[PDB]
Amino acid sequence: YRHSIFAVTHVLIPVWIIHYYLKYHVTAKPYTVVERKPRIFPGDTILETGEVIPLMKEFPDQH
Amino acid sequence: AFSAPAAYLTHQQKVLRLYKRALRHLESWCVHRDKYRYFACLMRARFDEHKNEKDMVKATQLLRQAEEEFWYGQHPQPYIFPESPGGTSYERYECYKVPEWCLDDWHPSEKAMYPDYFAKREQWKRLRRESWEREVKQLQEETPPGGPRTEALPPARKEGDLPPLWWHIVTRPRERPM
Amino acid sequence: PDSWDKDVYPEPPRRTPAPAPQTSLPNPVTYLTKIFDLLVDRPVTLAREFIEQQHAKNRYYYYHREFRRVPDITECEEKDILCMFEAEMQWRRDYKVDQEIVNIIQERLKACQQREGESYRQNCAKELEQFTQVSKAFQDRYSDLGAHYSARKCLAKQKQRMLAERKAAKEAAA
Amino acid sequence: MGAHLARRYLGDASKEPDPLRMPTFPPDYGFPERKEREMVATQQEMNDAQLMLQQRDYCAHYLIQLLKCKRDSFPNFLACKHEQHDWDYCEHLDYVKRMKEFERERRLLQRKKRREQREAEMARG
Amino acid sequence: MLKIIIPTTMLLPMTWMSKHNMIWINATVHSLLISLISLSLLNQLGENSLNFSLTFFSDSLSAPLLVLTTWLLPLMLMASQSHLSKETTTRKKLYITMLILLQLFLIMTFTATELILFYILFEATLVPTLIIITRWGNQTERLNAGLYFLFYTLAGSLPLLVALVYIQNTTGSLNFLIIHYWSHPLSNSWSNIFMWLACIMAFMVKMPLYGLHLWLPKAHVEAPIAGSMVLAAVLLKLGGYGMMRITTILNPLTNYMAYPFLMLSMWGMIMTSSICLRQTDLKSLIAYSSVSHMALVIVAIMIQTPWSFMGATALMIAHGLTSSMLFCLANTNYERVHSRTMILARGLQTLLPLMATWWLVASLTNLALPPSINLIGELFIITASFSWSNITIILMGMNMMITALYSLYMLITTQRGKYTHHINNIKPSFTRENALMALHILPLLLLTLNPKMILGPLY
Amino acid sequence: CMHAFFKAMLFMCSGSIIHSLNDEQDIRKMGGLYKAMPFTTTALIIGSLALTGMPYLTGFYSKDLIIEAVNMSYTNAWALLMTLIATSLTAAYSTRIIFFAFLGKPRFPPLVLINENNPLLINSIKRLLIGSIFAGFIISNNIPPMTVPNTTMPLYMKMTALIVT
Amino acid sequence: SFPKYKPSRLATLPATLDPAEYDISPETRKAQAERLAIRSRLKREYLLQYNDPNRLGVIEDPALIRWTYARSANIYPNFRPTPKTSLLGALFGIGPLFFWYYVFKTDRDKKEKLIQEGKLDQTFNISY
Amino acid sequence: DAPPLTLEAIKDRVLYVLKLYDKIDPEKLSVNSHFMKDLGLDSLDQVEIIMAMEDEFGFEIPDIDAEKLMCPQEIVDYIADKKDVYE
Amino acid sequence: QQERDPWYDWDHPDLRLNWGEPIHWDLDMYIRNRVDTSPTPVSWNTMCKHLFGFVAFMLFMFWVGEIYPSYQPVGPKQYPYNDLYLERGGDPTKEPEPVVHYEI
Amino acid sequence: VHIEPRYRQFPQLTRSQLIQAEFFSATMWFWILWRFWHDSDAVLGHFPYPDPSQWTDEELGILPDDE
Ligand SMILES: CCCCCCCCCCCCCCCCCC(=O)OC[C@H](COP(=O)([O-])OCC(O)COP(=O)([O-])OC[C@@H](COC(=O)CCCCCCCCCCCCCCCCC)OC(=O)CCCCCCCCCCCCCCCCC)OC(=O)CCCCCCCCCCCCCCCCC
Ligand SMILES: CCCCCCCC/C=C\CCCCCCCC(=O)O[C@H](COC(=O)CCCCCCC/C=C/CCCCCCCC)COP(=O)(O)OCCN
Ligand SMILES: CCCCCCCC/C=C\CCCCCCCC(=O)O[C@H](COC(=O)CCCCCCC/C=C/CCCCCCCC)COP(=O)(O)OCCN
Ligand SMILES: *P(=O)(O)OCC(C)(C)[C@H](O)C(=O)NCCC(=O)NCCSC(=O)CCCCCCCCCCCCC
């Protein structure tokens, strides 16, 4: 019970406040949260436009 | 610490202080107990060799040469007890030492939290106040006209008195106060 | 989001690859994302819906102040204090707007560096040249006016620049 | 560390190669027909994969394959042993090619020394 | 400005008409109310100043100084009522009258729109200060300290009066707005050099410049606590405000004439910090720290860039608050043991814990600890100096190291170690003293929260 | 990261020894603690092995790669030599701590107050002890490859760190 | 024999190595006795005041008063302009100022010469 | 943390050390015996005895004080006073 | 004060001073928190010589190792597209001088 | 658990601490052996080091000296 009251207060209330602050106030202005763009590899499926990034050419494989 | 120093150190006192310091530094060099016992016995052999010496000029020269040898061969990092002046635990509990005069500035509610302690403290304060005149009179009766020639203090010569200048010695803070 | 202008603050389209798992092991990141959406995102979204409902009942508007142009220090006569005052105030407002334009371009540059990541040296060449041009023009305008800058001092600086450029052009055409 | 350092410093620095100036002989000098190295990964592919600039060498395709493998099998961080070995082997081959370049430079330098000594002796005689 | 000026002139009759035991209460409460009213001046503009009338105007440089003055008056009342318990009612009212008169003169000084009215008020501040020092100081040396303070200031400021009337005859006006809009370059000539010297030397003496600073330790050590608080927090800032204002008409001659003053300021900053390292008196240590910080402000004004002026404003406000707090702490210690020697009272952390906390916070702000406004101002001055030249960083770094050294030396000496055994009258800290320290320190951290309010007009 | 793990554990074991011997910090007065204090003994041994670069503990995955990169780079010759000598001296002073604190006969005062059976101490050291064994492997295998490895090198140069240790 | 120890100002001579410690005169003993008597007299005075049950406050230390007075207020009355004092004052108060003046003047002259010649990298230098 | 000292414990430990001294006969050793007046030791023996006590109790006795402890009871009283032992 | 006796019953134990005794002019810098002049096991001149010699020898050997670097018997590392001309910020309009790496 | 102080004797130990210390020493040694059994390339290397002396002048593109 002690750690249940501790966990809701100390973890739950701050995470609620911070997620509300970030989703609706911080990220309501340009360039406040900038994410590094995800890595794209050959033979990939771009979800935004349903695109297909082609595979690489045949390797000069050894053994 | 507890004892008043004299005007000078005698030759015997110097020799004994050198003996103790040399044994401590030898122990610092000889970490193990058996090796320390062996070399400590050899060191005492040297001291006993020069123990009987009538020529005090020769004795003083021997002491001087021994001091030079010790300074050359001393341990750069001798062992120090933790509570000793060079030690790691030296003066650690000085910030926890508070005086009883600091105690008597308490608020009445604070003092009410300890009713029995402060009754005994009032008894001690009365005992201190009832003896000060006898203490100062005893001090001024026994001093030479020139003044105190040493830092030693006399005891109480009577059956109802207390040793003069005793309050702070008796009521000094405990070694582990808090 | 309609909060800001996408032309002023551009961002490239976000290409997020689709997941292509190759293991039977469950994804702890996916499980924890589901837990986060259940425990945090839903309560905060409900709270914001309540607050936004309360806001829409008390809708009111604020406006952007519009300043009309006034004659500048070049047109002001010497020691004509009123025209000088109006021109100085206008120059101060324009100085503020130019400072904010430089701030916008710098924000573009920083965001592009972070967004491109490990290939920023090549992918942020467009933003670097734009910042270079804007900063060079801003520096040439307001570079060394001092603590007590004024429209008269900036006019003297520009007249000096124009004289130097005219002299250089004459020497080149010689 | 190595014997090449001893040869260059306590010996004939003129015959030993200089790492900061190598190569000093034309790449076709002694090679009748020499083929250029092949690059599999393209500039756009490396740029998309966000390879570090020092990782965009001629082995970058195996690195891209390793990154793709590690992303897909995330919870199992021991499932890309083959891709790791392929990248490591490509790096090994690149390194031995660098070693071959160094050795070619060394023996070309000493051949030049021998040829100039022969010319000097012929001129003297 | 009349809504702030008239309530002070009404503090006067209220002080003289209140009962004998309500003087401190009335003065403190209504000083706090006037401070609250003066807080409305911080709503400044980005283009120009607040031109209230023909006589008074306010700016981003004047407004924080007025707020600091009005806030400092009630704190001085609290410290004064600490040390003036046994005085007669008439003399208590005279002391409060001197404090109120000083505040009124300072308000009109910061808001005066003419250089001549500014001169009259900024010279009028001398009389209440001199009376306070030489009458309610404790030691014998208050008389000599008052003489030094008075004659240094007047020798500095009389050529300023001559220069001001000369400039009025030459240009037709001493209004700050007109001299700003109608300013002309100052040609390199001996006459212009001596005009520049007259103005700048007046304010350099008031600052003080290193070498013209002895009056400062003399007066700040020997003044009563309210005198010390107002001398360091506000009266030193008349020099900075005047130098910032009057350098409008001194260009481009300031580019060539600033070398001796910059050299004096940088080297004397080093020298006064080093002096602080080896001071046997606590009040003298705080006074020399004040000298070092004002040397930094002089450097900022002389290099005269938009980044240096903002740092100068921030450092002036921060130093006012910090030095006033340090003087109050030292005064509490003095009221315990009746001596200013630094090594006499030790172990004050184990005798008075909360005062040890106040000492720690004041000394942490005295050295530039981020993100405090002390550091903000010092860093802006350092950056502007770096753009001026690249060895100013060497001198500035040395000064920062020595500042940290002597601040922590003062803290460790007074608070740490073991208590003096025979000092058995260290009574627990009063609520009044604790509240005084809190009222000093909380506004500083709030100013850290909102820093654009003290960065001056160049922001 | 790896040094954080094992150095924190080493300091905690040192503190346990200090506390059990009445605030004594001198290895000349420690002794017999190998059997006197089992858990702190094993924890300190594991930490000192991890510090010196035992082939598969948390210090191997960083120190060994650092030494390999230093040997295989266009570096200062004196810097390389000093680095290798420092690795040897690291092994040396770790040996000194173990030898003078845990092996041999006791040298502490006769009132034996040794007691390391507190769950708080044991659990804290246990948590920092698991990390000093396995955290290097986990972290090394989960981070992306941010540098090109030194795949090819002479065998003696490969084994330089172990030999000097 | 053993290497000798050379005392410095920052590493003084130990008492056990001082040659005068082993050459003691009968006047040395009485000097020591007189010093101990002075210390005992001072200690008795301090201890009486210290243990006084009725004393409240600070036991004023005349030695401390004299030290603080000699350190500040007694310096100028006992100052005379001598060749040594004048030279040390001129050096320590004038040499640094002109040294720094020369350094900064030369640096700024070089900077302004580069600015005028138009070959100083001033790009992105917006804040001044 | 550590158990407090007692007068009996201090006495036991000092007499234990003295009985482990070879130059002292354990049969005729008592808590009031004088090291030189009735045990026949000398100054160097007393120095070694004091050093043994220092090692036993883990603290140092300064030379000014140690030169006066000529009795096991005197040593006990000194150590109790220094350690604030009253029982 | 560090050289002063620690086992004596000073009136100010931390400062190691007695009440009424004369105070050294430079007590402010000779406190135990400040400059220490206590004797050392090794003579000050020997300390200076050893320290200066060690640091000067290390500086000289770092310079020597700089002019005699240690490296591996390999050629320069090769990078694909004109030594990654565009990746390192090269101008797309201008044409780089080609860099060609051949097999071996 | 309360551990009584000992005087001049070996301190009282606990079965729990003995078994825990033994288990963790054994865990470390098992881990070292298990990692060496599988990943022995990390210690002994994985690819052979070429000997430059064995490379022919024909494959290194070095012409005969006379030519
Ligand atoms: C209005 C309030 C004041 C404002 C002042 C502003 C400037 C005005 C200047 C002229 C002021 C008028 C003249 C006053 C003379 C007073 C003399 C006197 O006896 O004073 C004590 C007297 C009471 O004491 P007492 O019973 O006579 O006993 C005297 C014994 O000596 C008691 O025995 P003791 O031994 O205890 O007393 C000894 C004491 C006795 O000594 C005194 O009382 C002497 C006081 C100073 C002498 C007068 C100087 C006049 C010259 C101008 C400068 C004045 C500034 C200070 C003004 C102080 C005013 C009291 O002397 C000392 O302690 C020596 C101190 C030496 C240093 C300080 C003295 C010099 C200060 C001035 C120099 C600084 C000037 C700076 C420059 C700027 C100037 C503006 O005080 C008063 O009567 C108060 C006067 C004001 C009453 C209120 C009037 C207004 C009523 C309400 C109006 C509401 C308006 C409508 C509002 C809207 C809503 C309805
Ligand atoms: C959110 C803000 C709202 C706050 C409103 C505050 C309004 C005032 C409330 C606080 C006033 C405190 C006292 C309130 C009523 C008095 C209670 C009482 O009876 O006690 C009196 C309290 O007496 C006092 O201490 C005097 C203080 C009360 C008067 C001072 C407050 C007047 C302030 C006026 C404010 C208007 C200012 C607005 C203009 C701004 C000017 C710049 C008796 O005490 P003593 O006289 O000291 O006893 C000795 C007698 N033998
Ligand atoms: C590297 C640091 C240099 C610092 C700045 C450089 C200045 C030169 C160094 C100091 C020279 C003198 C400066 C002022 C010092 C005053 C000298 C002094 O204190 O003693 C005076 C002596 O001065 C005089 O009275 C006569 C004036 C001139 C004598 C001293 C200056 C001589 C300097 C020599 C010139 C340089 C020699 C060149 C050698 C080659 C250098 C490249 C009094 O003598 P005493 O009674 O014994 O008091 C001292 C107590 N121990
Ligand atoms: P008790 O009162 O019986 O003591 C007897 C004494 C010694 C006081 C005699 O009565 C006495 O005075 N005898 C004549 C004086 C005398 O003893 N002189 C010689 C004393 S010094 C001596 O010769 C011994 C020196 C040898 C040891 C030197 C120590 C240096 C080694 C230090 C090494 C530290 C690290 C290992």
Short mmCIF file of all heavy atoms in Angstrom, two decimals, chain I residues 54-78:
data_model
loop_
_atom_site.label_atom_id
_atom_site.label_comp_id
_atom_site.label_asym_id
_atom_site.label_seq_id
_atom_site.Cartn_x
_atom_site.Cartn_y
_atom_site.Cartn_z
N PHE I 54 61.49 15.72 -13.38
CA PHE I 54 60.47 14.81 -13.89
C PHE I 54 59.62 15.48 -14.96
O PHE I 54 59.41 14.92 -16.04
CB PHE I 54 59.61 14.30 -12.74
CG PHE I 54 58.45 13.47 -13.18
CD1 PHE I 54 58.62 12.15 -13.55
CD2 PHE I 54 57.17 14.00 -13.21
CE1 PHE I 54 57.56 11.38 -13.95
CE2 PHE I 54 56.10 13.23 -13.61
CZ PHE I 54 56.30 11.92 -13.98
N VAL I 55 59.12 16.69 -14.67
CA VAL I 55 58.21 17.32 -15.62
C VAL I 55 58.95 17.72 -16.90
O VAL I 55 58.41 17.59 -18.01
CB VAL I 55 57.49 18.51 -14.97
CG1 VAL I 55 58.45 19.64 -14.68
CG2 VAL I 55 56.37 19.00 -15.86
N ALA I 56 60.19 18.20 -16.79
CA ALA I 56 60.95 18.58 -17.98
C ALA I 56 61.31 17.37 -18.82
O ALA I 56 61.25 17.43 -20.06
CB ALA I 56 62.20 19.36 -17.58
N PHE I 57 61.67 16.26 -18.18
CA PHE I 57 61.94 15.03 -18.92
C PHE I 57 60.69 14.55 -19.65
O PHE I 57 60.77 14.12 -20.80
CB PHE I 57 62.46 13.97 -17.96
CG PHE I 57 62.57 12.60 -18.57
CD1 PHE I 57 63.62 12.29 -19.41
CD2 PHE I 57 61.64 11.63 -18.27
CE1 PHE I 57 63.72 11.03 -19.96
CE2 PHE I 57 61.75 10.37 -18.82
CZ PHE I 57 62.79 10.07 -19.66
N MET I 58 59.53 14.62 -18.99
CA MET I 58 58.31 14.20 -19.66
C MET I 58 57.97 15.10 -20.84
O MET I 58 57.55 14.62 -21.89
CB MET I 58 57.15 14.16 -18.66
CG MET I 58 57.31 13.10 -17.58
SD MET I 58 57.44 11.42 -18.22
CE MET I 58 55.73 11.08 -18.61
N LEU I 59 58.17 16.42 -20.69
CA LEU I 59 57.92 17.32 -21.81
C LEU I 59 58.85 17.03 -22.98
O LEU I 59 58.43 16.98 -24.14
CB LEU I 59 58.08 18.77 -21.36
CG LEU I 59 57.01 19.36 -20.44
CD1 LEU I 59 57.42 20.75 -20.00
CD2 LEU I 59 55.68 19.39 -21.15
N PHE I 60 60.14 16.82 -22.68
CA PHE I 60 61.10 16.53 -23.73
C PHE I 60 60.75 15.23 -24.44
O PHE I 60 60.84 15.15 -25.67
CB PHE I 60 62.51 16.46 -23.14
CG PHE I 60 63.55 16.00 -24.10
CD1 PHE I 60 64.09 16.87 -25.02
CD2 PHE I 60 63.99 14.69 -24.09
CE1 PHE I 60 65.05 16.45 -25.91
CE2 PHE I 60 64.95 14.26 -24.98
CZ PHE I 60 65.48 15.14 -25.89
N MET I 61 60.34 14.21 -23.69
CA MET I 61 60.03 12.94 -24.31
C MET I 61 58.73 12.99 -25.10
O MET I 61 58.59 12.28 -26.09
CB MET I 61 60.00 11.84 -23.26
CG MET I 61 61.37 11.48 -22.72
SD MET I 61 62.55 11.11 -24.02
CE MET I 61 61.77 9.71 -24.80
N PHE I 62 57.77 13.81 -24.68
CA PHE I 62 56.58 14.01 -25.49
C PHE I 62 56.92 14.69 -26.81
O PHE I 62 56.39 14.31 -27.87
CB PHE I 62 55.53 14.81 -24.72
CG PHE I 62 54.70 13.97 -23.80
CD1 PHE I 62 54.54 14.32 -22.48
CD2 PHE I 62 54.09 12.82 -24.25
CE1 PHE I 62 53.79 13.55 -21.63
CE2 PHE I 62 53.33 12.05 -23.41
CZ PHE I 62 53.18 12.41 -22.09
N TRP I 63 57.81 15.68 -26.78
CA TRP I 63 58.26 16.29 -28.04
C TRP I 63 58.99 15.28 -28.92
O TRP I 63 58.79 15.25 -30.14
CB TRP I 63 59.15 17.49 -27.75
CG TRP I 63 59.79 18.07 -28.97
CD1 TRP I 63 59.17 18.76 -29.96
CD2 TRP I 63 61.17 18.01 -29.33
NE1 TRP I 63 60.07 19.13 -30.92
CE2 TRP I 63 61.31 18.68 -30.56
CE3 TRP I 63 62.30 17.45 -28.73
CZ2 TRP I 63 62.54 18.81 -31.19
CZ3 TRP I 63 63.52 17.58 -29.37
CH2 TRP I 63 63.63 18.25 -30.59
N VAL I 64 59.84 14.45 -28.32
CA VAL I 64 60.57 13.44 -29.08
C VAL I 64 59.61 12.44 -29.71
O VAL I 64 59.75 12.07 -30.87
CB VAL I 64 61.61 12.75 -28.19
CG1 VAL I 64 62.20 11.55 -28.90
CG2 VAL I 64 62.71 13.71 -27.83
N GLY I 65 58.62 11.98 -28.94
CA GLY I 65 57.64 11.06 -29.49
C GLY I 65 56.73 11.70 -30.52
O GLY I 65 56.12 11.01 -31.33
N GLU I 66 56.61 13.03 -30.48
CA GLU I 66 55.89 13.73 -31.53
C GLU I 66 56.68 13.74 -32.83
O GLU I 66 56.12 13.53 -33.91
CB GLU I 66 55.57 15.15 -31.10
CG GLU I 66 54.68 15.90 -32.06
CD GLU I 66 53.25 15.44 -31.99
OE1 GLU I 66 52.89 14.76 -31.00
OE2 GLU I 66 52.48 15.76 -32.91
N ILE I 67 57.99 14.00 -32.76
CA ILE I 67 58.79 13.98 -33.98
C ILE I 67 59.17 12.58 -34.41
O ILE I 67 59.70 12.40 -35.51
CB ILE I 67 60.08 14.82 -33.88
CG1 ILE I 67 61.06 14.21 -32.89
CG2 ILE I 67 59.76 16.26 -33.52
CD1 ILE I 67 62.32 15.01 -32.74
N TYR I 68 58.93 11.57 -33.57
CA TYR I 68 59.08 10.17 -33.94
C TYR I 68 57.80 9.42 -33.61
O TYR I 68 57.75 8.64 -32.65
CB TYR I 68 60.27 9.53 -33.22
CG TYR I 68 61.61 10.06 -33.66
CD1 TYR I 68 62.33 10.94 -32.87
CD2 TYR I 68 62.17 9.68 -34.87
CE1 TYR I 68 63.55 11.42 -33.27
CE2 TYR I 68 63.38 10.16 -35.28
CZ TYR I 68 64.07 11.03 -34.47
OH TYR I 68 65.29 11.51 -34.88
N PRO I 69 56.74 9.63 -34.39
CA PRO I 69 55.46 8.99 -34.07
C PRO I 69 55.50 7.50 -34.32
O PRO I 69 56.35 6.97 -35.04
CB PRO I 69 54.49 9.69 -35.02
CG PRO I 69 55.33 10.06 -36.18
CD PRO I 69 56.66 10.45 -35.61
N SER I 70 54.55 6.81 -33.70
CA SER I 70 54.35 5.38 -33.87
C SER I 70 53.11 5.16 -34.72
O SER I 70 52.05 5.71 -34.43
CB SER I 70 54.20 4.68 -32.52
OG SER I 70 53.49 3.47 -32.66
N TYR I 71 53.25 4.35 -35.77
CA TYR I 71 52.14 4.08 -36.67
C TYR I 71 52.22 2.64 -37.13
O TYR I 71 53.10 1.88 -36.73
CB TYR I 71 52.14 5.05 -37.85
CG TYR I 71 53.43 5.07 -38.63
CD1 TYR I 71 53.60 4.26 -39.74
CD2 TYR I 71 54.48 5.90 -38.26
CE1 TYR I 71 54.77 4.27 -40.45
CE2 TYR I 71 55.65 5.92 -38.97
CZ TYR I 71 55.79 5.10 -40.06
OH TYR I 71 56.96 5.11 -40.77
N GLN I 72 51.28 2.25 -37.99
CA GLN I 72 51.18 0.91 -38.53
C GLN I 72 51.56 0.89 -40.01
O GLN I 72 51.39 1.90 -40.70
CB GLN I 72 49.77 0.34 -38.36
CG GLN I 72 49.42 0.01 -36.92
CD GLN I 72 50.42 -0.92 -36.28
OE1 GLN I 72 51.06 -0.58 -35.29
NE2 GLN I 72 50.57 -2.11 -36.85
N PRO I 73 52.07 -0.22 -40.52
CA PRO I 73 52.53 -0.25 -41.92
C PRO I 73 51.37 -0.41 -42.90
O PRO I 73 51.19 -1.44 -43.56
CB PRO I 73 53.48 -1.45 -41.93
CG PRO I 73 52.93 -2.35 -40.90
CD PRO I 73 52.38 -1.48 -39.82
N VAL I 74 50.56 0.63 -43.01
CA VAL I 74 49.40 0.64 -43.90
C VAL I 74 49.37 1.95 -44.66
O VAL I 74 49.93 2.96 -44.23
CB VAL I 74 48.08 0.43 -43.13
CG1 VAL I 74 48.06 -0.92 -42.48
CG2 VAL I 74 47.90 1.51 -42.10
N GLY I 75 48.72 1.92 -45.81
CA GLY I 75 48.49 3.12 -46.58
C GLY I 75 47.30 3.90 -46.07
O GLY I 75 46.63 3.51 -45.10
N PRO I 76 47.03 5.02 -46.71
CA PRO I 76 45.88 5.84 -46.32
C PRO I 76 44.58 5.07 -46.51
O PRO I 76 44.44 4.27 -47.44
CB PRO I 76 45.96 7.04 -47.26
CG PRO I 76 47.34 7.04 -47.78
CD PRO I 76 47.76 5.61 -47.84
N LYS I 77 43.62 5.32 -45.63
CA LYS I 77 42.30 4.77 -45.83
C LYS I 77 41.63 5.44 -47.02
O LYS I 77 41.82 6.63 -47.26
CB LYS I 77 41.44 4.93 -44.58
CG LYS I 77 40.16 4.11 -44.62
CD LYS I 77 39.46 4.10 -43.29
CE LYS I 77 38.24 3.20 -43.32
NZ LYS I 77 38.59 1.78 -43.59
N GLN I 78 40.86 4.66 -47.76
CA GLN I 78 40.27 5.12 -49.01
C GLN I 78 38.77 5.28 -48.85
O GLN I 78 38.10 4.43 -48.24
CB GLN I 78 40.58 4.14 -50.14
CG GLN I 78 42.07 4.01 -50.42
CD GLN I 78 42.37 2.95 -51.44
OE1 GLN I 78 41.70 1.92 -51.49
NE2 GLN I 78 43.37 3.19 -52.27
#
